[PDB]
Amino acid sequence: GKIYEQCELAREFKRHGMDGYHGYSLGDWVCTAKHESNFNTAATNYNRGDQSTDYGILQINSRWWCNDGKTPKAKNACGIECSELLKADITAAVNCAKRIVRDPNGMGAWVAWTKYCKGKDVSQWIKGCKL
């Protein structure tokens, strides 16, 4: 895996048109990744409540979104192996994030976005980054 530089991640999000995607900004996405994974693709989190695990830089869940082969009542809506979300390349995570965000909840799917980023000045996350 890899730990992204803050501005490196912003540039990757922009590369993928996350930039204004469904009304959300680069700052929103970078703010979320900070709070979810500390910018680390190797990040994982176990959830006792439903035996699921959150994977990678946007902490994508094994119940609904990716397949990890070990979660009960799983759906794999993104059509991706969770383990691939742990590698340095974040395109799969981004593609899946675009799918998630299209649901009615939007970026609300990330509780950490609503807590730390929603309705705040998120432009500081990208200030000084050359984009």
Side-chain angles (χ1 to χ4, degrees), residues 1-2 4 40-44 55-58 60 66-69 76 78-96:
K2 101 174 221 167
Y4 274 75
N40 191 357
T41 69
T44 59
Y55 293 88
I57 204 162
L58 286 169
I60 291 165
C66 61
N67 180 59
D68 78 356
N76 194 14
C78 289
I80 190 156
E81 293 299 299
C82 297
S83 84
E84 300 178 0
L85 301 176
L86 298 181
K87 294 183 75 56
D89 186 70
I90 63 163
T91 294
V94 171
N95 286 167
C96 183

Side-chain angles (χ1 to χ4, degrees), residues 8-98:
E8 186 195 14
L9 180 58
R11 275 188 282 282
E12 284 299 351
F13 286 143
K14 176 169 187 175
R15 230 177 129 233
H16 289 288
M18 289 289 51
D19 190 61
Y21 187 78
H22 280 230
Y24 298 107
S25 63
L26 249 35
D28 290 296
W29 289 104
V30 174
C31 183
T32 306
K34 173 61 174 178
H35 288 281
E36 290 296 334
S37 68
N38 205 3
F39 297 147
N40 191 357
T41 69
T44 59
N45 170 75
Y46 188 67
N47 307 299
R48 280 213 122 60
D50 67 350
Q51 269 59 282
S52 75
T53 305
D54 305 314
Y55 293 88
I57 204 162
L58 286 169
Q59 289 290 276
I60 291 165
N61 185 268
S62 71
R63 165 83 131 104
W64 307 109
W65 303 114
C66 61
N67 180 59
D68 78 356
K70 58 205 192 176
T71 304
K73 299 176 195 152
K75 291 168 88 193
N76 194 14
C78 289
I80 190 156
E81 293 299 299
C82 297
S83 84
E84 300 178 0
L85 301 176
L86 298 181
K87 294 183 75 56
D89 186 70
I90 63 163
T91 294
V94 171
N95 286 167
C96 183
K98 285 178 163 175

Side-chain angles (χ1 to χ4, degrees), residues 5 36 42 54 59 68 76 79 101 115-116 124 129-130:
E5 308 163 6
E36 290 296 334
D54 305 314
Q59 289 290 276
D68 78 356
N76 194 14
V101 86
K115 183 167 181 190
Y116 299 102
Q124 190 64 39
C129 301
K130 97 130 35 204

